Amino acid sequence: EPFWADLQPRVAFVERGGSLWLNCSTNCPRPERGGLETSLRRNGTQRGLRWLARQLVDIREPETQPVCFFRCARRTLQARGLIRTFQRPDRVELMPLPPWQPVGENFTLSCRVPGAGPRASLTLTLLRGAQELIRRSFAGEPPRARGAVLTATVLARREDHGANFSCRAELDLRPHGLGLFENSSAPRELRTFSLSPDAPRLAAPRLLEVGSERPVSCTLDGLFPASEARVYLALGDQNLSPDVTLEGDAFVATATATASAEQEGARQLVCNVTLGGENRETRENVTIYSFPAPLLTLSEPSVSEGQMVTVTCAAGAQALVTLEGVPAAVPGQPAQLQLNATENDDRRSFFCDATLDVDGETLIKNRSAELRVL
Ligand SMILES: *[C@@H]1O[C@H](CO)[C@@H](O[C@@H]2O[C@H](CO)[C@@H](O[C@@H]3O[C@H](CO)[C@@H](O)[C@H](O)[C@@H]3O)[C@H](O)[C@H]2NC(C)=O)[C@H](O)[C@H]1NC(C)=O
Ligand SMILES: *[C@@H]1O[C@H](CO)[C@@H](O[C@@H]2O[C@H](CO)[C@@H](O[C@@H]3O[C@H](CO)[C@@H](O)[C@H](O)[C@@H]3O)[C@H](O)[C@H]2NC(C)=O)[C@H](O)[C@H]1NC(C)=O
Ligand SMILES: *[C@@H]1O[C@H](CO)[C@@H](O[C@@H]2O[C@H](CO)[C@@H](O)[C@H](O)[C@H]2NC(C)=O)[C@H](O)[C@H]1NC(C)=O
Ligand SMILES: *[C@@H]1O[C@H](CO)[C@@H](O[C@@H]2O[C@H](CO)[C@@H](O)[C@H](O)[C@H]2NC(C)=O)[C@H](O)[C@H]1NC(C)=O
Ligand SMILES: *[C@@H]1O[C@H](CO)[C@@H](O[C@@H]2O[C@H](CO)[C@@H](O)[C@H](O)[C@H]2NC(C)=O)[C@H](O)[C@H]1NC(C)=O
Ligand SMILES: *[C@@H]1O[C@H](CO)[C@@H](O)[C@H](O)[C@H]1NC(C)=O
Ligand SMILES: *[C@@H]1O[C@H](CO)[C@@H](O)[C@H](O)[C@H]1NC(C)=O
Ligand SMILES: *[C@@H]1O[C@H](CO)[C@@H](O)[C@H](O)[C@H]1NC(C)=O
């Protein structure tokens, strides 16, 4: 039985910044020299015959090898040991995914667990809801190195809208006799959208008569989420309130649009829809007209018989006026038809036609009035 040196514990696993006791002993009856050699710290100490104890506090190093040495009978007697540290995955961070992610396009997922060690004992897993997307074990990494990073790129889908993404960090110390420490990051909700480059189809009449209700409709296709989409449809600068329903992935905006006049002779119909960070618009110009139908009025209601009269129309100097088939003569006016009253002319209808062209389209309206002859 020769002389020996013994320190306890031989190998010790202690949390980073923690503390532990080392008492180094020997069988030498009267050692001339003894002490503990390490790089870390001292808090308090307990010694005596054949053994000394040191309190190593605040351990900031991944791996250290404390050596306790003794001297008896002018010989060097030493003992070596091992102290390693770990760090819980207390801080786990997930990157701030884009506000709106296009459906059918890839996006990055990166879980970040800084400071956690040892790296080889870290198992990182990306989670969508309760489902595991990917599992990456870092086993085979240097024991000295800490921290872990897991990056994976997945495909944005339809269901991915309103779905939670997180990352689970597992530090497995179990084979070392300590245990398993796992902590999950903050779940992040994703919002996905798909907006077709196609322009919305707008159904509108070319001409709009004042005081008449002409229905208009603005629709599109392939919009998700459909309910999330906001739609504006109006007449010129005058706001409207379209009834909006949802047929499939398509929205249907339908309402009746009246005319005022107001202003002026022509305008545009504006329909635009903002979904997420993108928006589409279709503008169909529409000419607006007012039709002042000519008057059938007479110079005088009676006029017996034999006295001439002057008949007027007044389409408003726009349309070409024809009163009972006469191309008046002269234009820009309710131009006159001069007729001497006759008994045979009793109750004769005057046909007044007004031909007005707007935006290249011709419109006419007709009626008749009579005159009594005494
Ligand atoms: C989603 O992201 C992944 C990863 O960035 C990409 O998918 C990859 O797209 C490329 C382009 O077609 C391909 O990668 C490689 O293609 C060559 C042939 O050109 C082949 O020899 C390689 O083995 C590899 O497949 C491939 O389609 C695909 N690769 C994988 C592993 O998925 C792309 O950015 C996105 N995928 C889409 C949009 O489908
Ligand atoms: C996915 O994760 C998100 C958070 O990133 C979860 O949202 C959270 O849960 C619900 C919304 O579904 C909210 O519930 C709250 O309940 C309490 C008690 O009833 C009430 O006082 C609150 O006013 C609210 O209604 C909660 O606020 C919300 N948290 C945040 C920050 O928005 C979502 O639930 C997860 N998905 C699933 C399927 O669980
Ligand atoms: C470090 O080791 C020494 C080895 O001597 C321990 O001292 C012994 O303590 C036991 C207690 O069960 C006694 O029975 C022995 O008689 C002690 N040895 C001697 C030589 O007196 C010491 O206690 C250990 N340190 C700690 C903190 O336990
Ligand atoms: C390090 O020294 C501190 C004193 O600065 C020791 O603290 C004593 O013991 C416990 C543990 O912190 C405290 O609750 C007591 O109040 C402290 N005693 C006194 C008299 O102050 C501590 O034990 C030492 N060791 C470690 C590992 O911290
Ligand atoms: C949705 O419609 C509204 C109508 O009020 C648009 O508002 C104007 O649109 C023009 C052309 O896009 C802009 O130049 C003006 O600055 C807007 N002014 C106001 C007060 O909104 C709106 O722009 C349309 N949305 C999109 C994305 O075009
Ligand atoms: C889990 O990680 C979060 C990340 O911020 C941290 O705030 C929390 O203290 C951790 N919990 C435990 C028990 O480690
Ligand atoms: C509609 O009118 C606008 C002017 O307001 C004009 O720029 C545009 O070309 C017109 N549309 C067509 C198809 O001509
Ligand atoms: C006027 O005559 C045209 C052509 O005969 C006809 O289409 C139209 O209905 C008539 N107007 C009225 C109010 O009946």
Residue numbers in the entry: 1 to 374
What's the publication's text?
ICAM-5, initially called telencephalin, is an integral type I transmembrane glycoprotein of ∼150 kDa that is expressed exclusively in telencephalic neurons. It has nine immunoglobulin superfamily (IgSF) domains, with a total of 832 amino acids in the extracellular region, a single transmembrane segment and a 64-residue cytoplasmic domain. In addition to integrin recognition shared with the other ICAMs, ICAM-5 has unique characteristics within the subfamily, as it mediates homophilic adhesion interactions that promote neurite development. The crystal structure of the four most N-terminal glycosylated domains (D1–D4) of ICAM-5 was determined in three different space groups and the D1–D5 fragment was modelled.
Comparison of the three crystal forms indicated some flexibility at the interdomain interfaces, which is probably needed to facilitate cell–cell interactions. The largest movement between the most divergent R3 and P4322 structures (r.m.s.d. of 2.7 Å) was ∼16°. The overall P21 structure is nonetheless more similar to the R3 crystal structure (5°) than to the P4322 structure (11°), even though the tetragonal and monoclinic crystals were prepared under the same conditions. This could indicate that interdomain movement depends more on crystal contacts than on crystallization conditions.
